[PDB]
Structure formats: C-alpha cells, structure tokens
Amino acid sequence: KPINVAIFGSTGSIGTNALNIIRECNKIENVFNVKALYVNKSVNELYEQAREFLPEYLCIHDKSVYEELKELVKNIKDYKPIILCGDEGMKEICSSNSIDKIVIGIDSFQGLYSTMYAIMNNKIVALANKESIVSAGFFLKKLLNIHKNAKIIPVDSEHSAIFQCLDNNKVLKTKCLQDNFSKINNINKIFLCSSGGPFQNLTMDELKNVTSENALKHPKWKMGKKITIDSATMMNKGLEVIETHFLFDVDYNDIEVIVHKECIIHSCVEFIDKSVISQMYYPDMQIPILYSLTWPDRIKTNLKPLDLAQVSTLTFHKPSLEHFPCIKLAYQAGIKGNFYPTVLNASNEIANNLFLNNKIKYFDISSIISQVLESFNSQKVSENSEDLMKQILQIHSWAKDKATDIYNKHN
Amino acid sequence: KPINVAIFGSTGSIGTNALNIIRECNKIENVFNVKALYVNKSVNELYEQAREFLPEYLCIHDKSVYEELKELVKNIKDYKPIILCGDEGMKEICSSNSIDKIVIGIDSFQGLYSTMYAIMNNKIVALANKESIVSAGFFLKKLLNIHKNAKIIPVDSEHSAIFQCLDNNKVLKTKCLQDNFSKINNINKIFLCSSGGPFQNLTMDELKNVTSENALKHPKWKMGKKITIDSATMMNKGLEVIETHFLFDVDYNDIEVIVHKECIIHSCVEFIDKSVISQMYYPDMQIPILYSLTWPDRIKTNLKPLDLAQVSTLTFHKPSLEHFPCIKLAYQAGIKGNFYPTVLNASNEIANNLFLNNKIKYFDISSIISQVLESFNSQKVSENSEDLMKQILQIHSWAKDKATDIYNKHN
Ligand SMILES: O=C(CC[C@@H](c1ccccc1)P(=O)(O)O)N(O)CCc1ccccc1
Ligand SMILES: O=C(CC[C@@H](c1ccccc1)P(=O)(O)O)N(O)CCc1ccccc1
Ligand SMILES: [Ca+2]
Ligand SMILES: [Ca+2]
Ligand SMILES: [Ca+2]
Ligand SMILES: [Mn+2]
Ligand SMILES: [Mn+2]
C-alpha cells in the first residue's frame, strides 16, 4: 500500500523538495516509504537526511567519501542501512524489488545511467533531468520499447503541467516517449511557457554587456548556477522544446514558446478541437514531484491555495529570437534530428560554463554552439542498445572538446 | 459508428451553434447524423433546416402551425420524415432507438420535460438549460439514480470548462449530478469565471439609476434579453454557482466567483493537491456543444486557434457583493438548500422581467428576490419522483406569484 521511493540526488533542489512534500504527506498515514537516498558527494547533508528518514539504502557516488559516510552513520542508534557507493550502488538500488518509483534529481552522466538502470528494471521513473531526454532521447525510447512496464513521468515543471492537462483516460493507453503519444491524446499544439529570464527586457546593446553576475545576483527565484545561466540565454527553454518533442511526440512546428513573466500558467495544451487546457499554480516543484509519485491519482496537500484575484494580471508575449538565439539553435538541432540534440546539449555545457566563469560574452554562447552544430556530421544510428549508448557518449565528448577548441582558438 | 443527435430548440442560439459545429465537423469527416429537430413555433426556419439536414424526425410544440410544416415539407423531394407535435412528439423523439445524444437548448417547462424524457430513455443529454438544474436539481438527481445509464453533460460554457479539466478515467467512475462527484474527481475548489457584465465598473449611485436599456444597448456580446439582464445583475453567475454545486457536488464555500473581463479562461478547477487546471479559448459556444457530443473523445475542428501572444493580457478580480447583491442571494439560497434555489430562480424570473420592462429599479431586483426567499418555509422533500416534480412546479408557481404580489404591494 505505501509507495516505495528512491531519490537520486537527494541533497539537490529536486531531492530536497521531494523529501519536503513526502514528509508532509506522511504525517498521519504511511503514504510513502523513503527506501533509498543517493548523492554524488554531499556526505554530511546525506547523513542528516538519513537520521530523519532512515532509508534501507544509502549510496554516494564519490568513493573517496564512502568511509566518511559509514563513520557518520554509526552514530545513528539501531540503524543498519545497506551503504553503497558508485555505479554498482546505483544499479543495486534500481534493481531492488523493494523499490517502485525512482526520482531522478541528478544531471549529466549519473542522471543518464540512473535513468537507464531504472528503466531496465521496469520502474516508474520520475525524471527531472531534462538533459538526459535531450541528449539520449532516441536511446531512452528504444529502452522503453524493450522494458514494457517502465514509465517516465515528467517532473520538469512545464512538462508536468502539460502531462497534467492531458486526459488520464488516454494517457493510460500510452506512455511518455512512445510513438503516437500525441495522436492518442488528441494533442494539436503545445504552449511552452517561460519566465523569460533576467535579461528579457534588455536592448541588444545592453545584452552585449551582460555578465554571469548579472544573471546570478538578486534573482527572483534562487536556483543552481547552470540552469540560471540557461534561463538567462533561454537555452533552458530550447532544451525544454526538445524535451517536449521527445516526451509527447509533438512536432517542432507545433511547439510555441511563450514568455509569461508572472510564472502562474506553467504551460498549455491545445487539442485537435482547438480547446486549450492549462495548469497553473505559484512557481513550485512540490506539485510536479508529488504528482509524478501519485499519478494517476492525486493526494491532499497543505500548499497555499492559488489566489488568482491577488495575482490579478497574467501576460504573454513571443520571445525575440534575435535577443535569444539559443532558442533558434535548439529548434534547428531538434528538426535536424540524428545526434544534433546531443551536440547542442554538450556544446551548451561548455559555453554555459565559459560564460559562468567570465571567459566569454553573451553572444559568444550561441556563436560557439552554432559552430559546433555546423561542424558535426550526421552518423548512422546504432541499432543495438549498448552501441547507441556508446555512440551518444562519444559524440557528447567530441562536442565538448570541439567547443573548447573553438574557445581556445578565438582566445 | 455515427453519432446520432437530436436538437431541441433547433432555431435558438444553442440549436444553431450546434448545427453549425456539426456541419463544419462533418466537412472534415462524417461523424454526426442529425436525426431529429424540434422547435417551439419557428416553422419557417425549421423548414429551412430540414432541407439541409434531412432528419428522420421533425417536431413542433404548437399544434396550430402543424399543418403548415407538413405543407412546407412536401416541396422537399425524396423526403418522408415523421412529423410530430407537442409534448407527445417530444416523448417520441426521446424514446427513439435511433437517437444516442440529445441537445437541450430550450427553456422553461419544455426544457425540463424534454430533459426528463431523455433521462428516462437512458440517453446522453447535453444540457444548456441551467435554470432546470437550479430549479429541479433534486428531481434530476433522483431521475439519474433511477436511470443508471443516462448522463447529463454540461453545455453552459463555464461548466463545460470545468468538465473538460477533469480526468475521464475518474469521471467514468461517477457522472454529473451524483453525490460524491467532486470526491471521486479529487476536486477541492472551483474558480467560476465571469465577464462581469455591462455594469461591472459603475458606482452604487450609478447603479441606483441604470435602466434595462443601459444593460441591453451596444453589447460587447449579443445574447437574449433575459440572460443579458442576468449578466448585468450578476444573477446569471449566482445561478451558475448553484449549477456548479448540483453538477459537480462542490460545496458553496469552495466555489469562488472571479471577474475575468477578457473571457478567455472559461473557469478553473483546483484539485486537492492545489494544482489548478483551466480551459481557455475565445468566447464560444461551439466547443462546449461539440464536447458534449464527442465526450469522452475529442474530434478535429477548423476553429481559429487561440493566439495567446495576441490576447497578451488576462485580468482577474473579486466581484463586489454590495454592487451585485444577487450573487449573495444565490449563495444564501444555495446554502439554505431545500427548495430555496427553486424560489430564487422563480422570483428572479419575475424581477428580471420587471426591470426589463422598466417597472422597477436595479436594487429592487435583489429586494424582491430577498423578500420572497424570506417568506418561504422549507418543505419536506418528497421521496417519490412524481410527487417531487409536482412540489417543484407548485413552489415555482408560488414564488412567481409572491414576487408579483411584492411588486404590486409597494407599487
Ligand atoms: O525550468 C525551470 C527553471 C527555469 C525557468 C523558470 C525560471 C523561473 C521561474 C519559472 C520558470 P525558464 O522559463 O526561465 O527557462 N523550472 O521548471 C523550474 C521552475 C520553478 C519552480 C519553482 C520555483 C522557481 C522556478
Ligand atoms: O453564461 C453565459 C453568458 C453570461 C456570462 C458571459 C457573458 C459574456 C461573455 C462570457 C460570459 P456572465 O459571466 O456575464 O454571467 N455564457 O455561458 C455564454 C458565454 C458566451 C459564449 C459565446 C459568446 C459570448 C458569450
Ligand atoms: Ca575520504
Ligand atoms: Ca489531467
Ligand atoms: Ca501538426
Ligand atoms: Mn522547466
Ligand atoms: Mn454561462
């Protein structure tokens, strides 16, 4: 009866929000069992979570703090968790019969491999790691085809919103990342809402001068550095366009980015009859996380009710692609298909980090990514699962090195 | 298999919008057969419709235009329809095996009676006559418990909006007008959007002297006189609050009226997790009517797509109960329960018509209704369906007489 959950990335933004809503839902009844907590290397933070939630499993990727973890946990009386490390620990958790649902709140390779193991073990995977979908979308679709009882449920707020706008009577007849998903759900088009980021109202002359300190400082909503920079360039939305494509089988010409600066409407679905359904709330990750764990039901929360009269005004406009060329790059990569999304994501990782570290300017971001995309030559897609995965990782590494080489030569 | 449809009140607003969307949808793919048309006495427009749609059945209320319809219909080549008359024609259409869905777009006794016959024959009934739900909701609920396979689908635009926000795998475990509909659908609260009407920004002193001409002239959206006056007083919205309560079993303290002057968001549903889902489009009756005929599926239309960036701004505010006291009266009658909603509806019918005819002032509308409500005493609710219907008719008639007497006494 309790939903048995593992959290990958339990000290990050998604992980901490997950545990916060789980704690609230478990006050009176045992709705969820927190069976496993995994982190990259935040050993002290994981220890503190273990004290509260007492999971059966604890895992740390970084083996150099494994011994520190085991020594910290000894101080917890009559608690005997299985303490694991590295990729073998990730696989053991994903394989456990005692786990039903896995929250993926970690990025990059750990996010990809944990998503893969969860699917291979026919789990429900609540995926907040958009980069895995963008970079490895065809690989995940292939895996989902083999492991027929696995399901990806989106946690990215916009994609959660879309998923919520659908009729569960039709959702239950397909699954995310399956061909024909949009046809079965009578989807015509998606409005993909965006905050627009901190630079939304700058002129082209002002935008030329922006620095990462301008994106990061005094933010309305405090988030990780990488995603803050992607929000400022709108590459975040560009990645979310490709994520939409893959999750919901929606054609690129039917995905429309809309800037909605109040961030109440989280996204909207237009059905084939031209009726539009939208999901709305305050900016929040707890509803998306909780819904991924309860779907297809909902459960009571004590979140503050939306007060629409107090919000009072909601606005919508189209983003300028001259100001936010990263959006255009993402559409171009998505439409080209093949491994261009892998290349996009990888080259962005480098450009984003160069800008974060004050090494390049705002329009150099899109210039580097564009040059790497132009340089990439299409490859035959491996039919075999493992070969395809290796192909993705090779192309990812190539794209990163190419971006770095471009920066090095114009430096 | 085609969808076989009957239209009651084919020459009215609901009726013509239904024929228009059916005609347009049919150009895309043949989904709908118009099997019966019924009108009150518009025999010339009925002839024109029968030429086009060639229904098996034609029926008119008024016997004294019966012969002329027979005669007009002779001119149509190859066409031998069953031509009927009055309440008996209505029963014959509703009991036909060749009819699956019935659109009720007529008011008053004819609306209540045709709804009743449609339910008694286990049909899907697409109901636009909100006054029958408000006045005779108890009777409808009882009938729907006796005829387990009958279903009412709402066509009133805000109620259609609500119904479209739901997951049909949950809706199919219940049906509208059933106790526990909101619990099964995990509904917490409803935002019932209003246009606010033509008097929305007037002062108390301006409202003291407004006339029916001020409500009716140069309307943003042209509708019948009665509903225009109801929109002006916001009694329309109060009736729609009671409608929401009956249709969806939502408590009155969980229904919030919000003035949304752009009329794009049609209403919103807050679930128990606090996630809010809304339906949006241009102001429109075609999507509500169409959804009632396709539910639980959707079909393709060639309606104009909503352009959110062009709409640009949506606004929301609370209505002033001091300016729109009819809203308060509707809540009070709803909360009191019993037959108070029947009394509200009947007395408003009189008060609306008095104001329309320049016999009373704006604040007299609420004053008359208030005084009628105050004079009513709660009645033992008959357990028997036939007695319950007679109680509703007698209370309706009493309430109209009472409103009339209050007018004549002060006058
Ligand atoms: O993709 C994102 C972050 C970037 C987008 C965003 C930024 C700011 C507000 C909302 C959305 P942007 O549209 O700028 O790319 N989210 O899904 C997280 C949304 C969220 C949730 C709780 C609190 C704050 C933010
Ligand atoms: O209840 C109503 C009419 C009164 C409400 C209304 C008035 C004006 C715009 C929208 C709604 P009000 O909120 O003033 O009571 N509808 O369901 C009709 C909606 C509609 C459809 C197509 C074209 C115009 C209007
Ligand atoms: Ca160490
Ligand atoms: Ca839904
Ligand atoms: Ca299309
Ligand atoms: Mn997002
Ligand atoms: Mn309405």
Numbering used by the authors:
A (entry chain B), B (entry chain A): 76 to 486
What's in the article?
1-Deoxy-d-xylulose 5-phosphate reductoisomerase from Plasmodium falciparum (PfDXR or PfIspC) is a homodimeric enzyme, with each subunit consisting of 488 amino acid residues. The enzyme DXR is also known as IspC, derived from the gene name ispC in the isoprenoid biosynthesis pathway. It is the enzyme responsible for the second step of a six-step catalytic reaction sequence catalyzing the conversion of the substrate 1-deoxy-d-xylulose 5-phosphate (DOXP) to 2-C-methyl-d-erythritol 4-phosphate (MEP) in the non-mevalonate pathway (MEP pathway). Accordingly, DXR, which belongs to the MEP pathway, a metabolic pathway not present in mammals, is regarded as a promising target for drug discovery. For the catalytic function of DXR, one molecule of NADPH and one divalent metal ion (either Mn2+ or Mg2+) are required per subunit as cofactors.
